[PDB]
Design a protein around this nucleic acid. Structure first.
Ligand code: SF4
Ligand code: NA
Length: 214
DNA sequence: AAGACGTGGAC
DNA sequence: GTCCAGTCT
């Protein structure tokens, strides 16, 4: 695995490559963000944004989601995929906000995780983007980039990846580094077509050198 | 704990 | 016709 100094070097470069990295999910408030991120699991941002475009016009509060039959909401988000479980989780999540959190999105990460459909990744995105709380959400891109570069071991859990980054990066930079890593993986270190040949980190990447040799 | 969930887009 | 875009039971 890379040394701390090297990992910081990698992150510094990603910042130069994607200085404008940000959350690409369209939302106007914390509630819309929460729904959007829940829908985002195993789905592309493009499709989530196309769907919420109309979804957020039809539904604006947790009462709107629980007022329609489950079958109706399922159709409204059908294009997202995993729509049966997500629609059910959303209705249960909205009922919980009303019953347990005074009808508002809680600002605590562990409290958010009590909502159905919300795991650690979802909760971290919400507290970070909506409430400015430092956190590192580890998704497919962050995990892949971390393992290819050697930030951690290939067998590490996503929690392990998260803890490794939290110890190497100043809390004040957690949120932006997370976004920079996501952009790096989404647009450069892609799952199917990584841009190794022109990568500024090729000189220290175990995965890159392994691919170039082939 | 492995396995189900799932449509849409990129090759 | 594969492969890629987290959470729950
Ligand atoms: S060398 Fe390739 S595998 Fe390594 S980080 Fe750059 S694009 Fe990703
Ligand atoms: Na949860």
């Amino acid at each position: 695995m890379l040394t701390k100094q090297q990992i910081r070097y990698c992150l510094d470069e990603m910042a130069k490559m994607f200085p404008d990295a940000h959350c690409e999910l369209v939302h106007r408030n914390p509630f819309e963000l929460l729904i959007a991120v829940v829908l985002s699991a195993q789905c592309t941002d493009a499709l989530v944004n196309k769907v919420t475009k109309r979804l957020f016009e039809k539904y604006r509060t947790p009462h709107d989601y629980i007022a329609v039959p489950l079958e109706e909401l399922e159709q409204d988000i059908r294009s997202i995929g995993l729509y049966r479980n997500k629609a059910r989780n959303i209705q249960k999540l909205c009922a919980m906000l009303i019953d347990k959190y005074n009808g508002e999105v809680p600002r605590d990460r562990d409290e958010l995780m009590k909502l159905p459909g919300v795991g650690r990744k979802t909760a971290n995105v919400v507290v970070s983007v909506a409430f400015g709380v430092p956190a590192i959400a580890v998704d497919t891109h962050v995990e892949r980039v971390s393992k290819r570069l050697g930030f951690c071991r290939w067998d590490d859990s996503v929690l392990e990846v998260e803890k490794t980054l939290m110890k190497i990066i100043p809390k004040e930079e957690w949120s932006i580094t997370h976004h920079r890593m996501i952009f790096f993986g989404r647009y450069h270190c892609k799952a199917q077509s990584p841009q190794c040949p022109s990568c500024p980190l090729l000189h220290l990447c175990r995965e890159g050198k392994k691919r170039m040799r082939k």
